[PDB]
Amino acid sequence: SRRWFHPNITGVEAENLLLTRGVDGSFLARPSPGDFTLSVRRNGAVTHIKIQNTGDYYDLYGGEKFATLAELVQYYMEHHGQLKEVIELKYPLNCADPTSERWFHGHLSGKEAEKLLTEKGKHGSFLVRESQSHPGDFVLSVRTGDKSKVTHVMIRCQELKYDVGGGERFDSLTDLVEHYKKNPMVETLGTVLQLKQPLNTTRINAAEIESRVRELSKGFWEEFETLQQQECKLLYSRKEGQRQENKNKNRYKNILPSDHTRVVLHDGDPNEPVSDYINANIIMPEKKSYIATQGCLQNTVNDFWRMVFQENSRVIVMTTKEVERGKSKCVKYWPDEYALKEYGVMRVRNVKESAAHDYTLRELKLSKVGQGNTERTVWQYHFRTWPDHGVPSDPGGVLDFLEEVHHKQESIMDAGPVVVHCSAGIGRTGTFIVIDILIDIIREKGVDCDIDVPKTIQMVRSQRSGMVQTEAQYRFIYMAVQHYIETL
C-alpha cells in the first residue's frame, strides 16, 4: 500500500517519472534532512511540495500536520480540494526499487544466504539477493523444513522484467515476490516453496549492539525507511477521534489515537453527551505499561486528570517545555509549588518541586473531591533540556532520567501505566517509550538477550500510529541502548 514512496530518487528523476510514465493526478513522495517532498503532476507540469519533520509530526507546506506519510497521502486522496498552491492526489506512481523491502539483501553470496537462513530462518523464511555469477539477475533463497533445507531459485532480468525461468514476467521484484507468495512454486518432487516471512535482519544480541551501531553508522537511514515501509501493514481505525464532539480535544486534528487501544474515560458527567474521549493510547509491551498522550489543551486538562486517576497512574513523563519556539506545546496542568487546585472533580496539590540538571520533579497529590480516601501521590518528571528540533547529542541525560523514572515506578505497589507525553504524543513520546522498553529487557537480562529495535517500534506503532517520527530519533534509540549496555 506504500508503493508511492521512492527512497532513492532525485528531483530530476521524479519529474522525469511523472511526465513520461504518469498523468495529471499522478504523484510520489521522496526523501530530501528529515525533509521530504510530495511531487505531483498537474496540467502537464510537475509541482513539488515540502514536508518537514523535526520530530513531532509530518508538516506539509500549505497543508496540515500528520502522524505518518501514509495518513498524509490517504487524507488528501480522500479529500479533494484541500491541498492547494488546487492539487489533486489521484494516481500513485509506484516504485519498483526493492531496497526498502524486508526480504531484499542486495549483494549476498549463496553460502552466506544459507548461513543466515540457518541461524535465524524458519520454515517459509526467505530473501532475495543479487546474482553472484550473472550481473543483473537475482536469487530467491527460501528455507523450508521441520530436516530442513534451503532452495535457491534463479531470477532472470530480461528487458527490464523479472521471471523465474518460465511463466509470467513481472515489472518489479516486489510484484514477483508477491505473486509467488500468493501462488507458491512447487518443486518436481512436490515441495511447496512457501514464502511465509522475510528473514529477520535486525534482531541482535545485546552485547553486539556496538558492532551493529558501527555497521549502521558506516545503515540507519535504510533500516529506518525499511521500517517506514511497513507502516501501512498495521490494522487500526481512528473513528472516535474523528467524531464532531471530539475534534477540539485533539491538539492536531489529524493526529489521532488508535480506537482499539485508546483510553476510554468512564464516570463522566451525564450532562456531557460525549465524555469518554481523550487523545491517548495504552501501550503494552510484547510488566510495566504506558499511556502515550498529547500535551494538554486548555479544554482537556480535566480529562487528563480523569485519565490519570482512573488508570491509577503514579508517574507522569513530560518531554516538552510548555512553550517551544513561541508556540504552546502543553498547557500547565499542574498547580504552582505548594498550591492546591481543582480540575473538575479532581483535586491536585503540588507538594514539592525538585530541580535536577535535565529535569524537574514535581511531587503531586491527586484525589477526587468529596473523597478523602482516594488520595495518591503522582510523580511528574518534566524533562526540560530536549532540543527544539532534532535529538540530544548525548543520551546520558535521557538514560539517567528514565532510570530514575523506572525506579520510582517500581517502588510503588500496583502502580498503573506510566503517562508519557510531548506535543502530539508520538515523536518524543514514542522515542522515550521505546528506549524504556528496550532498557527494561537489558536491565533484567543483561547482555544475554535479543533486541530488535524496528520490531519493537512496529509493536508500539500497532497501538498508536506514528510512534517514533524521524531517523534522528531512530538513531538516538540505538545510541541510548548502546550507551546503557556499556555502562553496566
Side-chain angles (χ1 to χ4, degrees), residues 12-20 22-41 43-51 53-60 62-111 113-114 116-121 123-158 161-162:
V12 178
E13 286 174 353
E15 292 182 0
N16 295 356
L17 217 53
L18 284 169
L19 292 171
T20 61
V23 296
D24 290 341
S26 286
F27 71 92
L28 56 81
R30 60 187 177 89
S32 165
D35 283 10
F36 302 89
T37 305
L38 180 61
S39 301
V40 191
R41 174 173 174 172
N43 283 3
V46 176
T47 182
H48 305 276
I49 315 170
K50 180 185 171 174
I51 306 174
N53 197 332
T54 59
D56 304 322
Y57 41 67
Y58 294 86
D59 193 346
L60 186 60
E64 308 177 340
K65 301 170 178 61
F66 299 91
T68 67
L69 286 180
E71 290 176 7
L72 184 153
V73 167
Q74 163 144 11
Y75 179 84
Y76 288 105
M77 285 193 66
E78 294 183 348
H79 289 240
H80 277 318
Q82 27 189 324
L83 185 45
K84 284 168 245 157
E85 284 179 7
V86 47
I87 312 172
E88 297 175 303
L89 300 190
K90 290 187 183 178
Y91 313 101
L93 199 154
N94 297 337
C95 179
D97 184 25
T99 55
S100 283
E101 299 279 19
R102 300 179 60 206
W103 41 256
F104 189 75
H105 286 236
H107 190 278
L108 187 69
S109 74
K111 188 69 173 69
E114 292 183 3
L116 298 172
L117 286 169
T118 295
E119 317 167 339
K120 256 185 181 180
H123 174 74
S125 300
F126 73 99
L127 58 86
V128 179
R129 60 189 176 84
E130 300 172 0
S131 196
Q132 197 68 60
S133 322
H134 307 79
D137 290 345
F138 294 93
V139 178
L140 171 69
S141 299
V142 55
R143 170 175 172 156
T144 59
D146 218 312
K147 231 74 224 157
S148 313
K149 73 188 186 123
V150 174
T151 303
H152 303 276
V153 177
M154 294 303 177
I155 303 175
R156 303 198 46 202
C157 183
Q158 313 186 254
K161 304 198 181 193
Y162 302 103

Side-chain angles (χ1 to χ4, degrees), residues 334-343 346-351 365-367 375:
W334 63 95
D336 295 339
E337 189 179 27
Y338 306 119
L340 177 79
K341 272 188 77 66
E342 289 179 5
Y343 304 103
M346 295 303 162
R347 181 180 289 144
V348 182
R349 182 182 300 278
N350 189 341
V351 174
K365 286 186 181 183
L366 168 64
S367 66
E375 195 179 61

Side-chain angles (χ1 to χ4, degrees), residues 12 54 71 73 104 140 195 203 222 252 275 294 300 309 315 375 387 465:
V12 178
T54 59
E71 290 176 7
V73 167
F104 189 75
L140 171 69
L195 315 182
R203 177 178 69 255
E222 297 162 318
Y252 308 96
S275 56
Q294 63 184 17
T300 67
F309 185 89
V315 180
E375 195 179 61
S465 69

